[PDB]
C-alpha cells in the first residue's frame, strides 16, 4: 500500500492554465445558486435547499453552517467537499487561534486559514482541488461586518454583495442595481429573497430556502447568564416561519 | 516521499536529463578562467538585455567559497546558489574538523560529487550548472583552476571557458595561450581574459566582469573603469 501519489495532480499547461482549478470552478458553476449581502448593521447569506427527493428530510442537510458564534458560511458546488471544509474550518478556528489568544478569530483570518487549506489541495501530492466556492459572512470587534468569497484556487476577495453558482451572472447584476451603503439588515434580507427567487424554479418558501444572518448579539441563544461581557452569538439561522413572514411583504 | 527515477539510461546508453542539463549551461552567460604564472583570473559575461539593473545589489557572478577560493558558473542561476551554499558549508566544516582550509582540488571534488549524486538519486533532477573553481592552496603559490559539469566529472585546466559561445572563446584560448610561457604578470593575464571575452561579448562596457585571485587569500574584483582601460588598449592595438 502506502500513498504513492507524492506528486502534484494539478499542473501548469503550456498556456499557463491550471486545469484542475478551472475544472473545479466549472463544478461550482453547475452548483445551486447562493448569495451574500452586507448591510450597515449586519450581513445576510442565503441559498436554495435543493432536495434530492421529497422523501428526504431536507432539514437534516444544512447548507448554511456556523463556523464561530460570529461567523457563518454557505457554498455552491460539491456538498461533501463543503461539509469536510466546515469541519476543518471549525477546528482550525480553535487550534490556530482560540487556544492561543483565548478569543475567536476575526473573519478575515479565519477566511485566510480556510483559503490556505484549499490552496494546499491545489499543490500537494495525490489530491484534487476542492470543488466548491465558499461565501463567508462574519463580524468582529475591530473590523466590523464583512463578507468574503473563497474559490477552489484558495484566492479570496471581500464583497459588499455577491453571488456564486448557477445563476450568479444574473444575480450579481440584480444586486448591483439594489445595493447601497445605507442598507439596514431587513432591507438586505428583502433584497436577498428577491434575488434568490429569480434562480429558483419550483417551490419558493421557508422549507425550500435556507437563510442566515450575522447581526446583533443574541443573549437568548447564549445558554447562560452571569458574565456581562459575554452577550451571545451574532450568527443566527432564520426559521421556516420567519422566512415566510417576510415573503408576504415581498 | 517522491522517489521517481528522472535520470535514467536510454537505449543508446545516454542519460538525457544530464545531457539536457548541459543545454541549460549552453544557454547561460559565458564564463572564462585563465591562470597565469602567479595568479588566476575569472572573467564573466553580463547580458545587456537587462538595463535599469541595480549593479550594487544584483547577485555577482563570481562567488567566494572561502577567503582563498572562488567559484563562477554558467547555467541556471537558482541552481548555482544551492551548490555555492553547500560548498561554503563544506569549506567551514573542513576547517572545523581537519584544522586546514580546503584545497582547490578537494572543494572541486566535493561540488562535483554533489552534482553526480543528483544524476542517480530518485525524485531529483540534475543541476543545470557547470562551474569554474579557482584559487590557491594554503601555503602554496601554484595557481589552481578546475571545471565541473552536471554529470559530475571534473578536471584541471590551464585555461577554460563555459556557457554560451564558449566554443568560440575556447578556440581563441587554444591558439593564444602558451603552456611553456603563461601570462607572467597580472596585467598579461587580465588582458588575455578580456581579449577572449571580446570575441563574444558585444560591447566592452558593463558586459564584462573580471575577478583576480592571487596567492595568500588576495582576491579583488576590478571596477568598470579599470576593465574599460583594457578594452581601450586592446582595440587601439587592433587598428593596425
Amino acid at each position: 500500500m502506502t500513498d504513492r501519489y507524492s506528486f502534484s495532480l494539478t499542473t501548469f499547461s503550456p498556456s499557463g492554465k491550471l486545469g484542475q482549478i478551472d475544472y473545479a470552478l466549472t463544478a461550482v458553476k453547475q452548483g445551486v445558486t447562493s448569495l451574500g449581502i452586507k448591510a450597515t448593521n449586519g450581513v445576510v447569506i442565503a441559498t436554495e435547499k435543493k432536495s434530492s427527493s421529497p422523501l428526504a428530510m431536507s432539514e437534516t442537510l444544512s447548507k448554511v453552517s456556523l463556523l464561530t458564534p460570529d461567523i457563518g458560511a454557505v457554498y455552491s458546488g460539491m456538498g461533501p467537499d463543503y461539509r469536510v471544509l466546515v469541519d476543518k474550518s471549525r477546528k482550525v478556528a480553535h487550534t490556530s487561534y482560540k487556544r492561543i489568544y483565548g478569543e475567536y478569530p476575526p473573519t478575515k483570518l479565519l477566511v485566510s486559514e480556510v483559503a490556505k487549506i484549499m490552496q494546499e489541495a491545489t499543490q500537494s501530492g495525490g489530491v484534487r482541488p476542492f470543488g466548491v466556492s465558499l461565501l463567508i459572512a462574519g463580524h468582529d470587534e475591530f473590523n466590523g461586518f464583512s463578507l468574503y468569497q473563497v474559490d477552489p484556487s484558495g484566492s479570496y476577495f471581500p464583497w459588499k454583495a455577491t453571488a456564486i453558482g448557477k445563476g450568479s451572472v444574473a444575480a450579481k447584476t440584480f444586486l448591483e442595481k439594489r445595493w447601497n451603503d445605507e442598507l439596514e439588515l431587513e432591507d438586505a434580507i428583502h433584497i436577498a429573497l428577491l434575488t434568490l427567487k429569480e434562480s429558483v424554479e419550483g417551490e419558493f418558501n421557508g422549507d425550500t430556502i435556507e437563510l442566515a444572518i450575522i447581526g446583533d448579539e443574541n443573549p437568548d441563544l447564549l445558554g447562560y447568564t452571569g458574565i456581562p461581557t459575554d452577550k451571545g452569538p451574532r450568527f443566527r439561522k432564520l426559521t421556516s416561519q420567519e422566512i415566510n413572514d417576510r415573503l408576504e411583504a415581498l | 516521499g517522491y522517489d521517481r527515477a528522472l535520470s535514467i539510461f536510454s537505449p543508446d546508453g545516454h542519460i538525457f536529463q544530464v545531457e539536457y542539463a548541459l543545454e541549460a549551461v549552453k544557454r547561460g552567460t559565458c564564463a572564462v578562467g585563465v591562470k597565469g604564472k602567479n595568479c588566476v583570473v575569472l572573467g564573466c559575461e553580463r547580458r545587456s538585455t537587462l538595463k535599469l539593473q541595480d549593479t550594487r545589489i544584483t547577485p555577482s557572478k563570481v562567488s567566494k567559497i572561502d577567503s582563498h577560493v572562488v567559484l563562477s558558473f554558467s547555467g541556471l542561476n537558482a541552481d548555482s546558489r544551492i551548490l555555492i551554499e553547500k560548498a561554503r558549508v563544506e569549506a567551514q566544516s573542513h576547517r572545523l574538523t581537519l584544522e586546514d582550509p580546503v584545497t582547490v582540488e578537494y572543494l572541486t571534488r566535493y561540488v562535483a560529487g554533489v552534482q553526480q549524486r543528483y544524476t542517480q538519486s530518485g525524485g531529483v533532477r540534475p543541476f543545470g550548472v557547470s562551474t569554474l573553481i579557482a584559487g590557491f592552496d594554503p601555503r602554496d603559490d601554484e595557481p589552481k583552476l578546475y571545471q565541473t559539469e552536471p554529470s559530475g566529472i571534473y578536471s584541471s585546466w590551464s585555461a577554460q571557458t563555459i556557457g554560451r559561445n564558449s566554443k568560440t572563446v575556447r578556440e581563441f584560448l587554444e591558439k593564444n595561450y602558451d603552456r611553456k610561457e603563461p601570462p607572467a604578470t597580472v596585467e598579461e593575464c587580465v588582458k588575455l581574459t578580456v581579449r577572449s571575452l571580446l570575441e563574444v561579448v558585444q560591447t566592452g562596457a558593463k558586459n564584462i566582469e573580471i575577478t583576480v585571485v592571487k596567492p595568500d587569500s588576495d582576491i579583488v574584483a576590478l571596477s568598470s573603469e579599470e576593465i574599460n582601460q583594457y578594452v581601450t588598449q586592446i582595440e587601439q592595438e587592433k587598428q593596425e
Binding site: - | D3, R4, A5, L6, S7, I8, F9, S10, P11, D12, G13, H14, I15, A112, G113, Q115, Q116, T119, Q120, S121, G122, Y146, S151, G152, I153, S155, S156, W157, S158, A159, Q160, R170, L173, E174, Y177
Partner: protein
C-alpha cells in the same frame, strides 16, 4: 512510462543493458595478469589541449594490494571506489589482515543491482579490479553494472574493447613477464586509440607483491613507449 527494474521479453533488465551501451562509449582500459604482477593501462582522452592531462584520474588505488581502472561514465565510479576503499580498510579493522581481491570485488558488485523506485539507476561504468593476495595470487577482475564479475587473465573494456580483446587472445600466455605485459598494454592501446599514443594521453600502472600498487610516472612510461617503437622496428 515503464519501471526501472523491468525485464525485457528476452529476460534481461532494460536498464542494465542500456548502461552497457554507455560503457562502450567510454575510453579504453586494459588489464593483463602475469605471475610477476598485474598491469593496468588506460586511455586518458582529453577533450581539449588546454585540459591538464595529469588531472585525468582513470586509474585509482583501492588499497596497497589492490588497484582499479575504469571506463564509461567515470563520475559514477567515485562512490564505487569510496565503497571499495571503505570495505578494504574496514576488513583490515575487523580482521587485522589484507582483504581478498575476490571479496573486495564481490563487495563492489553488491552495489550494482541496488537500484529501483536505493539509487535511481544502475552505474554507467565498468571497472577492472587488479590485485594480489596470499591465497589466489595475482588476480584481475571485470566488474559490471549487472552485478556480475568475471576473473580474467587479460581483459579490455571501453570503445576499442572487442578489437583489443581479440589481440589479447593471441598475445597472452602463462609465462609472460611484467616488462612484456607493460609493452603489450602500450601496443594494444596505441592500436585502438584515435590520437597518437604518448606519455601524456595514456597512463600505465601495476600491482606487485613487493612494491604494491603503483601509478607509473610520465617519464617512466615515455621510456617504455620508446622501447616499444624500437622493438617493432626491429622486424
Amino acid at each position: 512510462d515503464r519501471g526501472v527494474s523491468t525485464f525485457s521479453p528476452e529476460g534481461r533488465l532494460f536498464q542494465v543493458e542500456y548502461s552497457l551501451e554507455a560503457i562502450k562509449l567510454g575510453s579504453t582500459a586494459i588489464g593483463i595478469a602475469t605471475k610477476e604482477g598485474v598491469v593496468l593501462g588506460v586511455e586518458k582522452r582529453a577533450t581539449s589541449p588546454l585540459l591538464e592531462s595529469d588531472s585525468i584520474e582513470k586509474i585509482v588505488e583501492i588499497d596497497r594490494h589492490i588497484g582499479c581502472a575504469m571506463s564509461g561514465l567515470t563520475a559514477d565510479a567515485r562512490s564505487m571506489i569510496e565503497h571499495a576503499r571503505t570495505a578494504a580498510v574496514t576488513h583490515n579493522l575487523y580482521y587485522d589482515e589484507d582483504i581478498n581481491v575476490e571479496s573486495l570485488t564481490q563487495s563492489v558488485c553488491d552495489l550494482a543491482l541496488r537500484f529501483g523506485e536505493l539509487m535511481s539507476r544502475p552505474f554507467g561504468v565498468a571497472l577492472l579490479i587488479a590485485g594480489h593476495d596470499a591465497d589466489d595470487g595475482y588476480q584481475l577482475f571485470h566488474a559490471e553494472p549487472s552485478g556480475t564479475f568475471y576473473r580474467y587473465n587479460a581483459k579490455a573494456i571501453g570503445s576499442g574493447s572487442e578489437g583489443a580483446q581479440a589481440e589479447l587472445l593471441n598475445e597472452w600466455h602463462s609465462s609472460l613477464t611484467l616488462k612484456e605485459a607493460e609493452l603489450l598494454v602500450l601496443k594494444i592501446l596505441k592500436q585502438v586509440m584515435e590520437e597518437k599514443l604518448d606519455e601524456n594521453n595514456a597512463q600505465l600502472s601495476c600491482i606487485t607483491k613487493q612494491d604494491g600498487f603503483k601509478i607509473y610516472d610520465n617519464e617512466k612510461t615515455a621510456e617504455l613507449i620508446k622501447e616499444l617503437k624500437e622493438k617493432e622496428a626491429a622486424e
